[PDB]
Design an enzyme around this catalytic site. Structure first.
Site, mmCIF file in Angstrom:
data_model
loop_
_atom_site.group_PDB
_atom_site.id
_atom_site.type_symbol
_atom_site.label_atom_id
_atom_site.label_comp_id
_atom_site.label_asym_id
_atom_site.label_seq_id
_atom_site.Cartn_x
_atom_site.Cartn_y
_atom_site.Cartn_z
ATOM 1 N N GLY E 67 0.883 -1.092 -0.131
ATOM 2 C CA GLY E 67 -0.160 -0.118 0.030
ATOM 3 C C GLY E 67 0.855 1.142 -0.119
ATOM 4 O O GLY E 67 1.822 1.374 -0.761
ATOM 5 N N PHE E 68 0.402 2.269 0.846
ATOM 6 C CA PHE E 68 1.215 3.511 1.034
ATOM 7 C C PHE E 68 2.179 3.487 1.676
ATOM 8 O O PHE E 68 2.342 3.119 2.871
ATOM 9 C CB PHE E 68 0.347 4.568 1.259
#
Ligand SMILES: [Cu+2]
Ligand SMILES: [Cu+2]
Ligand code: NA
Ligand code: NA
Lengths: 125, 375, 105, 124, 375, 105
Positions: E67-68
């Site tokens: 993800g981030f």
């Protein structure tokens, strides 16, 4: 063209990475995605806290404190990426550290990075 | 003088005047005839971006995030934009959620988020007419391919998913009324689909209007307001269908290329290969010299032709590898020429073919140009 | 909740009354990191430097939501009126090493 | 390379877009993200259904039916991207249409696109 | 392209022998000392990628999505890999979920997914030692920067978040045991943090070991097996702290650049500027001629020095713009040199510095190289 | 559940009994849109062409789970034995325009 050469500010084009206020910007220039020098693009959330740097203005020969507040809640813009580190310190001096995503305080607790604005917040002399 | 330099001048003037910076969130300018949207399906990436562009200034005025291969729509009247989109709980795996979001076209804030049950979106490289607004702007229609052909009905007004319509083995969705759309079928007929709040929809077919070995491209131009559907083939032959009466009327077929050009290897090629200007009744087609099975490659030329006679009105050397075209629908239209490889929208004078400005850094693989027909 | 907000956004410090209860901010510190006040007292933070700072109280301290005060630029001030006895910790949003405490008696 | 020139197959390098089995590939070659010519990378899910194409093998002068099954449930690999269209038909002939995400039948109902394999499923 | 070429030759033989293609999902080869992981934070994109590479072959053998700004970790014994990652319900907005996933290093399948309450991860350009395994691999520790300094304790054995530890104003996490880890403080001390199942940790600070105007980079090298923390400053001075006893012993400081090099404007620069080979007791540092506030730009040289004496052993001219380095931990190690700008990992012989092979197309902005010290 | 599977994988068309209940597949079509059989009967689909096909019953038709049959190459075959009266629709996984039903009486 020389990445390792000393930074040289200009005061004629805000979408270029050598624009004098972008002296410790890490990310993307908001003006390239529908924001402006000092405002967030539509739909994004404006952080309140940020890292800062003193950037020298070649126009008037004075230095100003820039607050690199992030516009958040969108995926990275991908337009006008820049990374400058004039006076940038490591993470244990976070007030001056620019790898951090400076999105704290944004509406809706938005924490994803889209772009960075370069408003002046003070004189550094 | 560039946008960036004007902006540096203004900011310098503000600072000389001692005016404080007080950051806020901007609003986009009002949707106008020259606003253009560029979607970046990003070569099948799990997340994607749409760029909202002022085509007159050649400036990005905002952006909208989407998930996996979303389908963008734009209200012809400028009042909203929407997309049908797909996300997963762990980036590209785990639980799938398909949904429609509606956005305010100036604040760009979502004003509806409507989940589509059972993951019904068709995941395919982006075809504008796989997801379509009714003419009244109240309903969004989207195609499902599998497990069976179907069309989803989303009530944008009540912000709710309504139902799936069983439809025959047809593809694409061309709405002609608040309750009717057309689709193109495997056998090469068109189907007309008329639907209510409940019950079997009413489905009729036209005759088969092309040979089985004449291939109609995935990107036909469709003007809802004119009710004109413009369908090129791999050879540049153009079918046109008039749907304005609420029923299909086939128009005389036209060739976009000459016999000499065809014998000399000219064929249409690209993504959004064709555009149609309503007020001028003109067709724009991306062509170049190519082998017959290189039909998705970029093209360096656009031919322009009257939709009624098939007369060649212009042939423009575009000066870039162009994948997709479209036009603004105002009086002296812009011709938009999108390069997937350069990740750049080139903005041309449609009358002369002259390149007027460009907008680069539009994501990783931008492919779809969308404009409102506001007249 | 346990506090009330005089001004939603920062105001000029020149606009703050003498003998008002003030915590100055300078050199990346709250200069009075442990402040004792009475129920009903109004505390006013004033930023003395170009470095922006705020005060920030986590969820459950001043009420259910966190109070994330606005960033004060140099010589900007920001006030809170404490309406209930207790001990309220706060920090500076970008600068979590900057910490303070208002003890309301 | 001239994008518009007739595609010319080779039988010497599976990682190049002119390898003969890639005549109607659209996406990314699985061999470049830890799969192989005909197998999916670890962690991805193997589609059972796909578009197909008849591809000419210059080594033996025979045409084989290739099944472009996708490997699914990952973000796109971004390595060795290719787009060829030999015999490729529009979406209303889906059996020969390559813009579709051919993930159907993949384990765990994986439907995101990672890369494409190029197995032979028959002679022409 | 001998790999693509060997494959084409193998497949040709298979077909000529009439062996049918029977598509399967592969498994990666077993982890070995020459496996190397390359993480792509993708210039702050909402989603990211890790590439698993056989360093000996120069071949991608697998990938993992994240993800981030995730934090990757790799068990030294090759038994698993993991990351702490962040996703959002609508690409980059909506509900945030922070979570740890553990993966099998051959099937690459997730074997645990452990949600972290209250979104506590520190979102920052990727620093390896902001998320760290304990030496037995049973525990993962991650740093929280805000609302207050803290270390989250994640039990990988039991697959459960345990608790957040309050710590002083310190940064990075260097574990030495199930119960103990070191951090670096604002004032320039190290903090030792020792924690049991319940209650506040016991925290012990060392002396301040560098002045306030001597700046320690965000990417120190730490060999958990050696207990050796190798910490460069902006001028290439190298602090070494021996943590092998679970108490901090300061080693003599060493200068990686010569006094003449320094006068001549040589400084370290890049991302992962420093690597450490445990069995050889050697330090590798990315250096170039550069102005002093250009400390994150790529470097074209690597100096190699004896950690014990500070003696220079080599200086390599790398032939590319290199942002990050690491080494394999086996007997005749590889020196890995990642270019964010080229999106390419260059693989070098660490002894001679010669480039052996490279792996390109590693995402959008790859930055972090991780290896297992298996031996 | 409503059916059993005689063979997990496709087998050779030549292995089908002279008297078996057969649905040929050819020219992108199943031979009948609606096959009638009795409870206990085995149906065998035989792909007659190079284009791979299968039969696919969605979840809830033959049991809780979908029954997605293996793809058949040319001259390969796949069977199902229907164990309960009812009407069971199916399609070909990549070709949703190929639809049939088995009516089990
Ligand atoms: Cu502060
Ligand atoms: Cu079929
Ligand atoms: Na940043
Ligand atoms: Na595809």
């Amino acid at each position: 063209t020389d990445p390792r050469a000393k930074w040289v500010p200009q005061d004629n084009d805000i979408q270029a990475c050598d624009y004098w206020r972008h002296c410790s910007i890490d990310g993307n220039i908001c003006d390239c995605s529908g924001g402006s020098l000092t405002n967030c693009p539509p739909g994004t959330k404006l952080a309140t806290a940020s890292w800062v740097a003193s950037c020298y203005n070649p126009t008037d020969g004075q230095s100003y404190l820039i607050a690199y507040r992030d516009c958040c809640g969108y995926n990275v813009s991908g337009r006008c990426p820049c990374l400058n580190t004039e006076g940038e310190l490591p993470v244990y001096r976070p007030e001056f550290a620019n790898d951090i995503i400076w999105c704290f305080g944004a509406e809706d607790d938005a924490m994803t990075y889209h772009c960075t604005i370069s408003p002046i917040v003070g004189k550094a002399s | 003088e560039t946008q960036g330099q004007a902006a540096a001048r203004a900011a310098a003037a503000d600072l000389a005047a001692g005016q404080d910076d007080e950051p806020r969130i901007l609003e986009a300018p009002a949707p106008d005839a020259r606003r253009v949207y560029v979607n970046d399906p990003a070569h099948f990436a799990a997340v994607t971006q749409q760029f909202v562009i002022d085509g007159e200034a050649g400036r990005v005025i905002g952006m909208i995030d989407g998930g996996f291969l979303p389908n963008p729509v734009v209200a012809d009247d400028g009042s909203f934009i929407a997309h049908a989109s797909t996300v997963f709980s762990r980036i590209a795996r785990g639980e799938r959620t398909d949904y429609v979001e509606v956005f305010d076209p100036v604040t760009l804030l979502p004003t509806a988020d409507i989940e589509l049950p059972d993951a019904p979106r068709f995941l395919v490289g982006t075809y504008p007419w796989m997801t379509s607004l009714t003419p009244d702007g109240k309903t969004l229609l989207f195609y499902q391919f599998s497990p069976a052909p179907a069309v989803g009905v989303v009530d944008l007004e009540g912000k709710a998913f309504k139902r799936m319509l069983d439809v025959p083995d047809c593809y694409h969705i061309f709405p002609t009324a608040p309750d009717t759309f057309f689709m193109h079928c495997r056998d090469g007929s068109l189907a007309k689909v008329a639907f209510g709040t409940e019950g079997t929809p009413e489905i009729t077919h036209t005759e088969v209007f092309h040979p089985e070995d004449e291939f109609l491209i995935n990107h036909p131009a469709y003007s809802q307001k004119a009710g004109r559907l413009v369908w090129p083939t791999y050879t540049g032959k153009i079918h046109q269908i008039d749907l304005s009466s609420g029923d299909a009327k086939f128009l005389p077929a036209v060739e976009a290329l000459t016999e000499a050009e065809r014998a000399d290897g000219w064929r249409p090629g690209g993504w959004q290969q064709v555009a149609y200007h309503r007020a001028l009744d003109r067709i724009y087609l991306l062509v170049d010299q190519r082998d017959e099975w290189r039909h998705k490659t970029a093209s360096r030329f656009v031919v322009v032709l009257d939709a009624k006679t098939g007369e060649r009105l212009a042939k423009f050397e575009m000066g870039h590898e162009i994948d997709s075209i479209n036009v603004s629908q105002d009086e002296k239209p812009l011709l938009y020429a999108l390069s997937t490889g350069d990740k750049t929208l080139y903005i041309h004078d449609a009358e002369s073919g002259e390149e007027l400005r460009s907008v680069n850094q539009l994501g990783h693989g931008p492919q779809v140009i969308t404009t409102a027909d506001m007249g | 909740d346990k506090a009330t907000i005089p001004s939603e956004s920062p105001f000029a410090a020149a606009e703050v009354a003498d003998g008002a209860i003030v915590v100055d901010i300078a050199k990346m510190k709250y200069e009075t990191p442990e402040l004792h006040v009475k129920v009903g007292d109004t505390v006013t933070w004033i930023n003395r430097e170009a470095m922006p700072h705020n005060v920030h109280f986590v969820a459950g301290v001043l009420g259910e939501a966190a109070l994330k005060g606005p960033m004060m630029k140099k010589e900007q001030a920001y006030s809170l009126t404490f309406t209930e006895a207790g001990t309220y910790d706060y920090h500076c949003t970008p600068h979590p090493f900057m910490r303070g405490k208002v003890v309301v008696e």
